[PDB]
Amino acid sequence: WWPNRLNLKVLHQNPAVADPMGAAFDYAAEVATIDVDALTRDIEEVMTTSQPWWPADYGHYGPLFIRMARHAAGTYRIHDGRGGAGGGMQRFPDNASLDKARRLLWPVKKKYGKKLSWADLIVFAGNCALESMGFKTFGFGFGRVDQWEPDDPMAAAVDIRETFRRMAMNDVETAALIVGGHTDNSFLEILYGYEWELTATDLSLRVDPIYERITRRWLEHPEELADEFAKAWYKLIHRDMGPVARYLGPLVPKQTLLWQDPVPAVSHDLVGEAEIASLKSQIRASGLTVSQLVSTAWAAASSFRGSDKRGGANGGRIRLQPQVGWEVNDPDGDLRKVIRTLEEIQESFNSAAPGNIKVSFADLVVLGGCAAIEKAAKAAGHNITVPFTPGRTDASQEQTDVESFAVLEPKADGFRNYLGKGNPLPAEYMLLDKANLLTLSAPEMTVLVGGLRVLGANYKRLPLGVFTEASESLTNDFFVNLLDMGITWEPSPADDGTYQGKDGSGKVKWTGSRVDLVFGSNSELRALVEVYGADDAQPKFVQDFVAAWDKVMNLDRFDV
Amino acid sequence: WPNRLNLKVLHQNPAVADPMGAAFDYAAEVATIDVDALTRDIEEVMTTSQPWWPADYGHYGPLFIRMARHAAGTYRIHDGRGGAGGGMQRFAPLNSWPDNASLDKARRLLWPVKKKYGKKLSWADLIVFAGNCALESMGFKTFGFGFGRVDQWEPDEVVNPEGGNPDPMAAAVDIRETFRRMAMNDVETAALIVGGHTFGKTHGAGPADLVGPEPEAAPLEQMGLGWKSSYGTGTGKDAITSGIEVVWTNTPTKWDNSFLEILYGYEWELTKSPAGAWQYTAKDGAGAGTIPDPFGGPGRSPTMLATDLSLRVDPIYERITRRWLEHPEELADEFAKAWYKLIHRDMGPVARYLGPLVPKQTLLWQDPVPAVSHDLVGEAEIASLKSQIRASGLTVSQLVSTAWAAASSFRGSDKRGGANGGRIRLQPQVGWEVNDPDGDLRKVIRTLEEIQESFNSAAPGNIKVSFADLVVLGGCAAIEKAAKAAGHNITVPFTPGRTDASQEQTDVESFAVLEPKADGFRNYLGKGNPLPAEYMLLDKANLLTLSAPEMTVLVGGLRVLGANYKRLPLGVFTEASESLTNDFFVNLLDMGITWEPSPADDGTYQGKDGSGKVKWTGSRVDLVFGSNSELRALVEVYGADDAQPKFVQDFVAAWDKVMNLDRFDV
Ligand code: HEM
């Protein structure tokens, strides 16, 4: 009825029923069988032909392909990660010359069909045009699955600065991109000659002192310009593809780059099933409460952005500076103790293991979270075993760009009941956005919140969400107590965001936050809460929470 | 949506937003519950007044009856949507409409019953069951009840008690019109108004301006509720839900003929209610002030709305109303039948009703089909029936058109129509303009009838074939022949079991709304439409419960197959006709052809090639796939080079789904 309401439609965007290929189709296995030589030949023969319905300017569609490649990959926003070359449905201001020219590539996708997506095709056509000009490129990596539903003065210098900084491009990369896309040295020579007749953009490279320094350096040294343009272009097209394990094809370079957030490759033999049991029995008698383990294992695995597929638990970054310094992770609490205890466990295990079986800290954090979940569930009457797939390695400090990780800090985490100052939208909207980023669905988000409440995973262990009298137990008490109409909620006297579900002859119980009551208030979410809050829905809730938790933990596992 | 195609309406209620997950059939769960225990629990929660919403006369019966009526009171025949169905009354604009006031409470009074069962009793079943049980709790034996209303998890895209001027004669026509859109005649409307208003009262009493916002705009401190009254204590003795303060009968917690004896006992004057105004009261000395106060105190006066008084003044209503005032057993009978029709209107055929309370009697408005009285055909006979159909002289265009005409009348909004029943032969559907009788349809019917006679005469025993099966079997045989001509060897699955109804079984009047005003798959842009052709195509596809890939592949198959209306060349982008290929896709995306509106402006376009010749001609439906970005992405999947067998398989799957849409008995 009332507009500006909570939009649950965002959670289930791009379902599996609108996908023509169905659920029996993985793009990786298809594009791994493609022949990039024939693809390059087809792209070139399209490049050197003049379609009658689109006059081929100078008989060479190269620069048009370059423009579409640079325009599909120019909509990447670091603060959110949406958009981008492949991680954003750029299809479905502009002059409409960016999709009518997308029809020029139809004779190429006609041959391949499902073995080559449009997102891969546009970027690869741009790259092949760039290589066909005469320039040589760093490399290319396929694997961009296409979605099926739309989701002169120095003033120009600072405007370009902000516009390119929103794309995670420093000054050298911005200068390289600007000098390249508009190009030999046919640019810097004419630009630095006769001042371009002293009469907008692309001239500020000679005005801004930091830009002018780099440009005048490149004036007599085209080698730096070539290397910097190759690196900047490769960063530009592959910005939102995630870990290096998602790159496919034989054109992917062997080198590893810092902006990809690299993690070391596995060097030892992973843990089997007896060693996993030994670890889960060792860090269940190590003096660590279920709350600490669950909160730590969620802190590492809730820094994942499903748009550009960066973050996650892989790499063991929770032990390193950008992740441990965040307010939400609470360095002033029990994160250092948990990290030190896990390091001690890892050192003890690696020094006494059969053969060359070794466990990594990144793996051990998630294994500890799984062990804590199992212990809590067993302390609730059930007997389960949460699945756990090893194969994580811990990155060192030198491989983590501190500035690049500042955009992953959560301004508001609904699952952990965190809320930082200066938020655009209210508490529930940020929870919805975070759940959408984690590629979660409405039932998965509901069950995950309802479990994390009773597991004591709240920020600073606040009682704002624990709707149960017995913590350290995975039960559906949150739902069955939220739906109870025997308590009358009201805003707290302290005028804060908290509430008060006071009843029982005037007594006050279940002090609740906003992201807690939004589940019982919103009818669409109350439906799911009633599904999980029934009398016989106790084991179904546990199984669903285990499934959601395992899905969240293994979000970043793209190598498997 | 009405200014740009909204493809998200095709994938409404996805499976990823369903908490119960896949492989969960509601029929199995709800068929194994204790109905007696459910009724006992409901009757237990009816008589226990809660302190957060007090009960009038210590009984939640009338509130449950009103909630059940309003849940099933949104059904509309033309679209078919609304009604109980998926229980949209919980999460929709429906929960926040001003005429659904205080019905958000009646869905929380039933929570203690829902939690005791869980997935074994959907909300939609409960909402309409409680009221039904309420009807039995007062002393009125209802017709029956059938569980099985599956529960959805996403909202979809889809009467004045004061007349503005409350003139009973001028409000009777409004009542008749608004009940005509629910397929209720005069006698059923009068029975529903009289019976439903025997139980209960009207709550509105106060300034009527001190009511809070709707639940969709209420603060989270109210926890999903709305209309929080601030006048007085707010709820119970001074609740405000509608504004009018009338108590109809002397015993609003029992069934009796006291509504008629009150309506036809006093003359009525007009007065202003404490909340709002414009209600009728007794005339001579305020009548007799003998009406129970819901929570105790002074007796009220006999009062009626303007809606209720219309039944006395309208000459059509007055005669039957007086007859019921004389004989009450007829009133009870018509009320039972009308209520049963009301709560089960949009539940589909009788094969979907579950539980022990479902009656054994058949009713005309259900469009009954005769029970199977023979052994169905196996696999040896089907392989011979297909050969006989193929060698009967019927071209694939006629067979496909007949099968689609039989099976495209279905609408998933209320699950009526479908290829079952075999009603393409019968009067309401054989004469529709879209099911072109000025052509080769009667010939197809005659050929299928003679094939049926030949097969049944030489029966191998107790195995016989029905015409309803024969239409779909001919469609599948034609598609098999087309695919074999195109080069692929496939076998379209066929599941026999359909039966042929008679002309007395079908109702001609109630099928005037199933007529397709615009069928996107066979162009037929019929006169009198509220939207362009493409939006009507999306509406038709959403009615068939089709997705976007299925709709695209079905359109692209029906074009080249020859299913078009009047066999127009308006959309057949293939050169070799009567063949199942993706030539509608590989030629729609052909960029060497320029599309311009035809000189004879009628909504059709001309596709000229580069040599200045009119190569293809298409319509808005045919050309919307090559222009809309979301749809063009699907066309490029079936329009590729290697995706010929994938296209054929997808088309066969879509055909199977459409044929077996209205098959709930299997
Ligand atoms: C044109 C047709 C009708 C009109 C204009 C009408 C009018 C109304 C109105 C305005 C209310 C609100 C009273 C309140 O909220 O306290 C109401 C309540 C109610 N209606 Fe109707 N009604 C109609 C038909 C029906 C039907 C078809 C049924 C049942 C099948 C029914 C049964 C009830 C009941 C049981 C209540 C509530 C009684 C209570 O809460 O004590 N009415 N009606």
Coordinates of N, CA and C and ligand atoms in Angstrom, one line a residue, chain B residues 56-57 61-63 65-66 69-70 101-102 159-161 175 178-179 192-193 195-197 199-204 241-242 244 248 305 307-308 335 339 342, ligand 1:
Chain B
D56 N -16.6 -9.6 21.1 CA -18.0 -9.2 21.3 C -18.8 -10.4 21.6
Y57 N -19.6 -10.3 22.7 CA -20.5 -11.4 23.2 C -19.6 -12.6 23.6
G61 N -16.8 -15.6 16.5 CA -17.4 -16.2 15.3 C -17.6 -15.2 14.2
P62 N -18.4 -14.1 14.4 CA -18.7 -13.2 13.3 C -17.4 -12.6 12.7
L63 N -16.4 -12.3 13.5 CA -15.2 -11.8 13.0 C -14.5 -12.7 12.0
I65 N -16.2 -15.1 10.3 CA -17.0 -15.2 9.1 C -16.7 -14.0 8.2
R66 N -16.6 -12.8 8.8 CA -16.3 -11.6 8.0 C -14.9 -11.7 7.3
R69 N -15.2 -14.1 4.4 CA -15.9 -13.5 3.3 C -15.0 -12.5 2.6
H70 N -14.3 -11.7 3.3 CA -13.4 -10.7 2.7 C -12.2 -11.3 2.0
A101 N -10.5 -3.4 7.5 CA -10.1 -2.9 8.8 C -10.3 -3.9 9.9
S102 N -9.4 -4.0 10.9 CA -9.4 -4.9 12.0 C -9.4 -6.4 11.6
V159 N -17.3 -2.4 -1.3 CA -18.7 -1.9 -1.5 C -19.0 -0.9 -0.4
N160 N -19.6 0.2 -0.8 CA -19.9 1.3 0.1 C -21.1 0.9 1.0
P161 N -20.9 0.9 2.3 CA -22.1 0.7 3.2 C -23.0 1.9 3.3
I175 N -25.0 -3.1 -5.5 CA -24.8 -4.4 -4.9 C -24.9 -5.5 -6.0
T178 N -21.7 -5.3 -8.3 CA -20.5 -5.8 -7.6 C -20.6 -7.2 -7.3
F179 N -21.8 -7.8 -7.1 CA -21.9 -9.3 -7.0 C -21.9 -10.0 -8.3
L192 N -26.5 -14.5 0.5 CA -25.2 -14.2 1.1 C -25.3 -12.9 2.0
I193 N -26.1 -12.0 1.6 CA -26.3 -10.8 2.4 C -27.1 -11.1 3.7
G195 N -27.8 -14.1 5.2 CA -27.1 -15.1 6.0 C -25.9 -14.5 6.7
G196 N -25.0 -13.8 6.0 CA -23.8 -13.2 6.6 C -24.1 -12.2 7.6
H197 N -25.2 -11.5 7.5 CA -25.5 -10.4 8.4 C -26.4 -10.9 9.6
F199 N -25.3 -13.0 11.8 CA -24.3 -13.1 12.8 C -23.5 -11.8 12.9
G200 N -23.4 -11.1 14.0 CA -22.5 -10.1 14.3 C -23.1 -8.7 14.3
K201 N -22.2 -7.7 14.4 CA -22.5 -6.3 14.5 C -21.6 -5.5 13.7
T202 N -21.8 -4.1 13.8 CA -20.8 -3.2 13.3 C -20.2 -2.4 14.4
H203 N -18.8 -2.3 14.3 CA -18.1 -1.8 15.5 C -17.9 -0.3 15.6
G204 N -17.8 0.4 14.5 CA -17.5 1.8 14.5 C -18.3 2.7 15.5
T241 N -13.9 0.3 13.4 CA -13.4 -0.4 12.2 C -14.1 0.1 11.0
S242 N -15.3 0.4 11.0 CA -16.0 0.9 9.8 C -16.7 2.3 10.0
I244 N -20.1 2.8 11.1 CA -21.5 2.6 11.4 C -21.6 1.7 12.6
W248 N -27.6 -6.1 13.9 CA -28.7 -6.5 13.0 C -29.7 -7.3 13.8
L305 N -28.2 -1.0 7.9 CA -27.5 -0.2 7.0 C -28.4 0.3 5.9
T307 N -27.3 -0.6 2.8 CA -27.1 -1.8 2.0 C -28.1 -2.9 2.3
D308 N -28.3 -3.1 3.6 CA -29.3 -4.1 4.1 C -30.7 -3.7 3.7
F335 N -28.3 -20.2 1.4 CA -27.1 -19.7 2.0 C -26.0 -20.7 2.1
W339 N -22.6 -19.9 0.1 CA -21.3 -19.9 0.9 C -20.3 -20.9 0.4
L342 N -18.9 -19.6 -2.7 CA -18.1 -18.4 -2.4 C -16.7 -18.8 -2.0
Ligands
HEM1 C1 -22.6 -5.6 -0.4 C2 -22.5 -6.5 0.6 C3 -22.1 -6.2 2.0 C4 -21.8 -5.0 2.6 C5 -21.9 -3.5 2.0 C6 -21.5 -5.2 4.0 C7 -21.2 -4.3 5.0 C8 -20.4 -4.6 6.1 C9 -19.6 -3.6 6.8 C10 -19.4 -2.1 6.5 C11 -19.0 -4.3 7.9 C12 -18.1 -3.6 8.9 C13 -18.6 -3.8 10.3 C14 -17.5 -3.8 11.3 O1 -16.3 -3.7 10.8 O2 -17.7 -3.8 12.5 C15 -19.5 -5.6 7.8 C16 -19.2 -6.7 8.7 C17 -19.6 -8.0 8.6 N1 -20.1 -8.6 7.5 FE1 -20.8 -7.6 5.9 N2 -21.5 -6.6 4.2 C18 -21.9 -7.2 3.0 C19 -22.0 -8.5 2.8 C20 -21.7 -9.5 3.7 C21 -21.4 -10.9 3.4 C22 -21.5 -11.5 2.0 C23 -21.1 -11.6 4.6 C24 -20.8 -13.0 4.8 C25 -20.8 -14.0 3.9 C26 -21.2 -10.6 5.6 C27 -20.9 -10.8 7.0 C28 -20.4 -9.9 7.8 C29 -19.9 -10.1 9.2 C30 -20.0 -11.5 9.9 C31 -19.4 -9.0 9.7 C32 -18.8 -8.7 11.0 C33 -19.8 -8.9 12.2 C34 -19.0 -8.5 13.5 O3 -17.8 -8.2 13.4 O4 -19.7 -8.6 14.6 N3 -21.5 -9.3 5.1 N4 -20.3 -5.8 6.7

